[PDB]
Amino acid sequence: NNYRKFGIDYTFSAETIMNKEILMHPRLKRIKFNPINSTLLKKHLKFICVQNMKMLKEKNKWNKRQEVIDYIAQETGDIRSAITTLQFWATSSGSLPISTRESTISYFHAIGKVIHGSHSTNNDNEMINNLFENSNNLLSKEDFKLGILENYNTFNKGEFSISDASSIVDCLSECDNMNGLPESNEYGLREVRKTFRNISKQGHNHGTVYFPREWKVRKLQNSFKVQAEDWL
Amino acid sequence: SKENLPWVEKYRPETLDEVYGQNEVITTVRKFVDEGKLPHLLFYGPPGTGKTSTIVALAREIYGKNYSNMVLELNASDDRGIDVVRNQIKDFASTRQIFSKGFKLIILDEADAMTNAAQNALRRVIERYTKNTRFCVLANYAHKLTPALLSRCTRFRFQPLPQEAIERRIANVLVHEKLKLSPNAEKALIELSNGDMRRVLNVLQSCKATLDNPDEDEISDDVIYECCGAPRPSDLKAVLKSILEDDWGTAHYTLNKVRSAKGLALIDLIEGIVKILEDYELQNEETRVHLLTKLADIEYSISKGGNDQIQGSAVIGAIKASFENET
Amino acid sequence: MSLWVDKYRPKSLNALSHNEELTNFLKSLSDQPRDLPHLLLYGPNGTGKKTRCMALLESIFGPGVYRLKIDVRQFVTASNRKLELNVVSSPYHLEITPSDMGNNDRIVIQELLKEVAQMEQVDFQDSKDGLAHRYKCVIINEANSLTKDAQAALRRTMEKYSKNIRLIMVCDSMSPIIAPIKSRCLLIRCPAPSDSEISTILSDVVTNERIQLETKDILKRIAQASNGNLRVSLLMLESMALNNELALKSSSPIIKPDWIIVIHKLTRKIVKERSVNSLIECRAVLYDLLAHCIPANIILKELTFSLLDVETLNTTNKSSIIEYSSVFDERLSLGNKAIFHLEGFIAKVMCCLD
Amino acid sequence: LQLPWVEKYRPQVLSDIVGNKETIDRLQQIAKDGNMPHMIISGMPGIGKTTSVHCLAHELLGRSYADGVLELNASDDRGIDVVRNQIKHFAQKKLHLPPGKHKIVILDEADSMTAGAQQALRRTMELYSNSTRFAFACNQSNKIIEPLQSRCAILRYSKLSDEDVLKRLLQIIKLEDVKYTNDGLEAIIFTAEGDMRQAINNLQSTVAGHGLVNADNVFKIVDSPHPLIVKKMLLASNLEDSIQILRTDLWKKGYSSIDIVTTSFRVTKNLAQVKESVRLEMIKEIGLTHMRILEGVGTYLQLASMLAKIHKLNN
DNA sequence: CGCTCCTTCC
DNA sequence: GGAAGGAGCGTTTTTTTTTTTTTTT
């Protein structure tokens, strides 16, 4: 029902809600929060389980509290979601697969997943399928291909064969000619992942990833257009 | 009135008995209406197979001659956005019949052109008002239909029209007109139809026009090819034989002469040659790979225009190079 | 004062000094301009196509065609994206560059040109009885850069309203022109001037400006450095004369466009080193070039031929280079972002050299 | 008249829903206890999500169902104004209910809700959770914004097994006194592809057409899922076998080229046997053929060339 | 996801 | 005096057609 490609309809964040002047105003202070870490979440889940020791012991789930607490801690950084999941598990006499709310991955996290792969998953096909199923909005945007193009050199601080870089860049060039079909994005990401997995080694030191600089070029082009119109 | 109509419309089936080729679907739907247990329907198939005709005939049979008063028909020519689904379709499906004539019917022709949001809104409208209303969705491309909508509809596939049904309809048309069709002309018409009745009727009308005196002149295969400007099988066979046996100069001259004799287009020659080669028994499979890939590339290039002579020479060279593998 | 490119620009067909056969053909066209067909002039950039079109118009109408003024026309898209276009006008003709509108060029064809085509130009007769009718002349600059939709929109406008309008399109290459538009036009090939004619024009300019020239060879060198672009030849002549106190000498350096020198440096860097880091620096250079609005295809041409000019490379290297250049030129034509294809070309060249 | 069996035999109690035994049992526990939390129900079409939520609401609220349930789906207005007025007033209503019972807001097809409405729902959930509980039903749980997911228990419904579908089909057959054979029920289950709605529709169609549910009678009307045919076409070890499958089973049956290529891409995404390089190359070829089809060249020759390229890659 | 510094825990 | 865990960094944002929601009207 939206069919709109503006910033706000894509992401709900301070940048899309506020503007540059407000954020950079000297009288406004911005503090960024991180997901609650495993230690604090585990501590508070144990506290809650202790507060409900009687019912847990009566239901015979007290002995298994540590297992579910540890699983919940590694699955989310949302305290409310963790508490809700714990309540759902404890109040259940039967056994069900414990699951929390899904968490989206960031842009640089997706770039890192494509370049280096995922620790949890060893099958690249499964990783790519999950990435496209859950992060379609991020992958579809054309800035992701530009990010891959501008960051693939970070692998081993750019100490791999020119042949692999040529293969990756040629694949991206071919994908740019596919009118933005999903097959194009899938093929590009799969090519990058396969190429980097073919040369992955323990003794590698990687570089720093950066956002693509196309926006700077666009601004410079606009300034050039204004100057050229003045000259004309 | 009907006499002035194009044949594709003048010969539109009025009753289900006039629909040919889809025996299984017609049988099942007729029994469903006989028992009055019609479910939500999906008619999936390629162009000109009888979907719209079948649904209109079924509506006529259910409601007799007054079907226009209790049937809501919508197609791609009408706006069918989410607002339309929420207001118009919803109100029609949620209101009583004109004279308590059982259930109401909503036909969504060419529903593959509807937006995802409208299709999503349709789910609960279909589900909640099933007692009073039944939906019919017609489509040629299933991938445009959301999974939820597909799950809700009983699916019927309209196959490409078999040869026998086309022959029967051609006989009916020939009797209705004062026309005479030769067996070879009928075979050519069936071959070029590709299972679409509309093409059959249009070509028949053009052939009747081509005749100087249709009251006594008979349509032959030559008339069909003249009307369609299509190559004859002999032309295709000669071109292929020259390509596979004669030298480059002779093959080029043969192709040029065959095309210039009747102004044949290269795409139709390629399609006929592909049909011929599909039945060829090749001992080397790599030959098939080369043939298919190169000819598909040539067809795609022709689709955008380009140089005709270069494309013809490319076809010749591609066939020769591919068949060098069989050596 | 005005630049020498415009100061000594010929203002009539008789003033043209190179490609005599083309001048004769244009004069034959001007003999009976009553039934002049639509024209499409194609040839290398900077050869004098626009000058010849203006000379033809002057022959048909008169010197007043050079009394040009500028107007701004506003267009609104289906998304309410207001924008503007510059329309140059003389009492007898109009000049537009719809390609400056990007993908919106079609709007210009659908709204402006059509309206111009529909409004029939009539005027009271000074001496005779009744109104007199005259067709309007419209020049479409950078015709080859129009989108296929705009070119399609041109067709029936050209055909139906042939009584009121006559189009003169100018392009540097006819490859991007759709077949129907070419079919609707009289095609005129405009060859570039030879080195001798460029040298003669430059010598006439030098004599007019009273610039001391040690030897005529300098002019020849200037010609050989312009690659047949007369406008560039005159610009470099003026720059060199000003930079040398209006005294040219055999030792005076030839001034070339800065981006050309940058591309030469990039070619040398590519030849010298072939590695990932070299590729990243090449990306930086390419982005710097693109920031100045240099077209991607132009960059690809200049880089390709600069690479082909390297003496150390062998036949296989150059053959592979030209193959990759053709492939990536097609990819640029069919692509959306040029950086991918330029990077791919450079990476392929690095692989083939190494 | 006579209702279609899909609606006639819609389960009215939680004990008549087959499959997802663990989830259905937990729902029964919630119904008997009362402490229903905010919940999200996700799964593929036609597996019982809507039926499960409706049955749970009915069991929980008893006679108070009419005044204690607010149902809204994609067919109703669900914009930000609706959240501001109708849902807010319903959640503000003071209704006397038995201990452990709360008002229920059912939001079917919650995925389609607009971003503004979803963001507005946060505050109403925060304020009126003591008296109101929300049950979202969707096909993609990820289409509900994270702040809303943070407040709800997640429940994912899996595809129904052949055993559960067979059990429900047998119950329906016994109720309708339908004559059948084992092969016929096997064919119905195989063609349903885990969708109970499709299984019931196909059974009803077969019974209406012929009454006796055999394999041949079922396959006269029902077609084998074309994804499996496409998988067979792609996995054929011989080019001629792939071409023969494409011709006989797909092209001459009236399947459009666009559908064939889209299904080929979907199937190739899930081929476990093949290597990653081969898979990505096949995806590239499928994408190029799809581009050609979208431009208007949707011919059988293009699909044959796609198959030839795929076979070349397999070698 | 990888790299670079401050705790935190034994 | 070994890691184990954690935080912070690595960022910016129009445009073709077409559909849809929202707010004021």
Ligand SMILES: Nc1ncnc2c1ncn2[C@@H]1O[C@H](COP(=O)(O)OP(=O)(O)OP(O)(O)=S)[C@@H](O)[C@H]1O
């Ligand atoms: N089974 C058929 N029997 C007799 N005539 C048919 C049949 N199918 C198509 N025709 C003829 O072709 C014309 C068009 O038939 P339609 O029912 O409109 O085909 P269609 O399948 O609905 O085409 P699409 O999918 O909307 S392009 C009819 O008026 C008939 O004259």
Ligand SMILES: Nc1ncnc2c1ncn2[C@@H]1O[C@H](COP(=O)(O)OP(=O)(O)OP(O)(O)=S)[C@@H](O)[C@H]1O
């Ligand atoms: N587990 C099931 N047990 C019995 N019947 C089922 C079951 N699932 C689906 N059905 C039947 O199919 C019909 C539809 O079931 P639903 O609950 O609406 O499926 P659904 O998962 O909600 O589909 P969506 O997500 O709205 S497309 C029911 O009336 C039942 O007759």
Ligand SMILES: Nc1nc2c(ncn2[C@@H]2O[C@H](COP(=O)(O)OP(=O)(O)O)[C@@H](O)[C@H]2O)c(=O)[nH]1
């Ligand atoms: N003396 C002389 N100058 C010419 C002639 N033709 C072109 N020029 C000049 O050389 C420049 C050519 O640039 P231009 O007219 O823009 O050619 P275009 O870019 O191909 O259309 C102009 O500055 C002209 O003044 C000619 O025949 N004689």
Ligand SMILES: [Mg+2]
């Ligand atoms: Mg139809």
Ligand SMILES: [Mg+2]
């Ligand atoms: Mg449902």
